[PDB]
Amino acid sequence: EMVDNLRGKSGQGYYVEMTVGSPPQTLNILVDTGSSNFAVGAAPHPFLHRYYQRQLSSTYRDLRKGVYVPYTQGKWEGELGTDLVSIPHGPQVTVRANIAAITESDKFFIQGSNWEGILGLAYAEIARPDDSLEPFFDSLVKQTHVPNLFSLQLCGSVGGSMIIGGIDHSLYTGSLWYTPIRREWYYEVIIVRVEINGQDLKMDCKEYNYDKSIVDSGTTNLRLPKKVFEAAVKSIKAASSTEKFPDGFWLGEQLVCWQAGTTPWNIFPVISLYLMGEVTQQSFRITILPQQYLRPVEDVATSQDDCYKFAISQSSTGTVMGAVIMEGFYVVFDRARKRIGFAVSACHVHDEFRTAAVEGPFVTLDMEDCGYN
């Protein structure tokens, strides 16, 4: 009954329906594996259709502590408190959790996104103000009999499914390949190799993980360390040289459009990200097609064409495998076994020539540890 319980709009995040307070106040909350704070708009804002009204909740408890959270994009400040929370289209349980009441924000809420809050699903180590603020999932597991695990199937209006407490076999095909969660703070993993159209980038694998690599459903793009990003773009341009695009495109500052239905998918290469396996020197790879890294930008004004933005960008905080990477894959966040599984999704991207895939195992003779720290 949790299938297709996610909605969203490209580049604006995926959200699930939740209720906070008593009586229940329904709100759409963005699913974010890239942070650990559960926060909801709690005051009027230009882009908010509704918000959390603490005065109307008889079960609310103020913690008398303020909180500030800065993201890559946007930031907000609010008041900490606790209240009862439930997930209509999820496990039928009610738990008391910490909630940050957003009273001030900057470039956080998105006009027309349809969500009013965020659910940080990562670990307490990155929660603000500090790790003593128990994240929502932790509270959920402690207070209920929900297994310490959740899976996300993001599909490219959009939708998807967030299965809490288990794995839904009808949401993927083939095998599930697991990569270790290197450290329990962000969902940190290790990339051991990167290929652009079968051609290895030939780089010390530590570069791919400088200073860390994570799985973040709350970030749109595939963000790469400067060195890797430059190498990647050079290779993608080479592969697509039959057409020349302005530098602004490769910088993600400009759209590229083609007449409706004529996008030349074939001139863009497949990007392979090899992830560390559960066994020494073993790995598996997930393949990304341009249908994933060329994000469609819907606009009625430009509807005679199909327009896209390059969804691969530079980062100075490590590799971020965002939503465009997760789309088309069934991703299992097995917190109980400190590992993340990937499998081809029931809504995977593909055309008559290529398809997104999860393949393994691959072996490496190199004995180097790809971990940066």
Ligand X SMILES: CCNc1cc(C(=O)N[C@@H](Cc2ccccc2)[C@H](O)CNC(C)(C)CCCC(C)C)cc(N2CCCC2=O)c1
Stretch of 89-97, 166-174, 219-227, 302-310 contacting ligand X, by CB under 6 A: 219-227
CA atoms within 13 A on the CB side of 259: 1
Q: Omega before 129 cis (within 30°)?
A: yes
**Is 314 near ligand X (CB under 6 A)?**
no
Residue 108 CB, nearest approach to ligand X (Å): 5
Q: Could you say which of 220, 283, 287, 319 contacts ligand X (CB under 6 A)?
A: 220
Site string for ligand X, 53-82 (x = CB under 6 A): ----------------xxxxxx--------
Nearer to ligand X, 55 or 316 (CB): 316
Phi, psi of 342 (to 5 degrees): -125, 140
Q: DSSP readout, 180-207?
A: E--SBTTBEE-EEEEEETTEE----GGG
**Is 30 near ligand X (CB under 6 A)?**
yes
Residue 160 CB, nearest approach to ligand X (Å): 13
Residues of this chain, 33-52, that bind ligand X according to CB under 6 A: 34-35
Asked whether the beta carbons of 63 and 78 are under 8 A apart, the reply is no
Q: What span, in angstroms and rounded, lies between the C-alpha atoms of 223 and 313?
A: 5
Residues of this chain, 99-158, that bind ligand X according to CB under 6 A: 108, 118, 126
Burial grade of 54 (CB within 10 A; 0-12, 13-18, 19 or more): buried
The active-site residue, picked from 83, 216, 306, 334, is 216
| 83 tagged catalytic | no
**Is 322 near ligand X (CB under 6 A)?**
yes
Residue 314 CB, nearest approach to ligand X (Å): 9
Interstrand relation of 14-20 and 6-8 (parallel, antiparallel or unpaired): antiparallel
Q: Is the dihedral of CA 102, 117, 189, 272 positive or negative?
A: negative
The site that binds ligand X (CB under 6 A) totals a number of residues, namely 27
| 32 tagged catalytic | yes
Stretch of 11-19, 167-175, 263-271, 352-360 contacting ligand X, by CB under 6 A: 11-19
Nearer to ligand X, 160 or 277 (CB): 160
Question: If we measure between CA atoms, which residue out of 128, 160, 123, 154 comes closest to residue 138?
Answer: 123
Stretch of 15-23, 197-205, 215-223, 297-305 contacting ligand X, by CB under 6 A: 215-223
Nearer to ligand X, 217 or 283 (CB): 217
Q: DSSP readout, 75-108?
A: EEEEEEEEEEEE-TTS-S-EEEEEEEEEEEEES-
Buried b (16+ CB within 10 A) or exposed e, 143-178: eeebeebbbbbbbbebebbbbbbebeeebbeeebbb
* Tokens 């598996």 sit on residue: 284
Site string for ligand X, 168-187 (x = CB under 6 A): ------------------x-
**Is 160 near ligand X (CB under 6 A)?**
no
Burial grade of 359 (CB within 10 A; 0-12, 13-18, 19 or more): middle
**Is 334 near ligand X (CB under 6 A)?**
no
Nearer to ligand X, 108 or 136 (CB): 108
Which positions touch ligand X (CB under 6 A)?
Answer: 11-13, 30, 32, 34-35, 69-74, 108, 118, 126, 186, 214, 216, 218-221, 223, 313, 320, 322
User: Which residues participate in catalysis according to the annotation?
Assistant: 32, 216
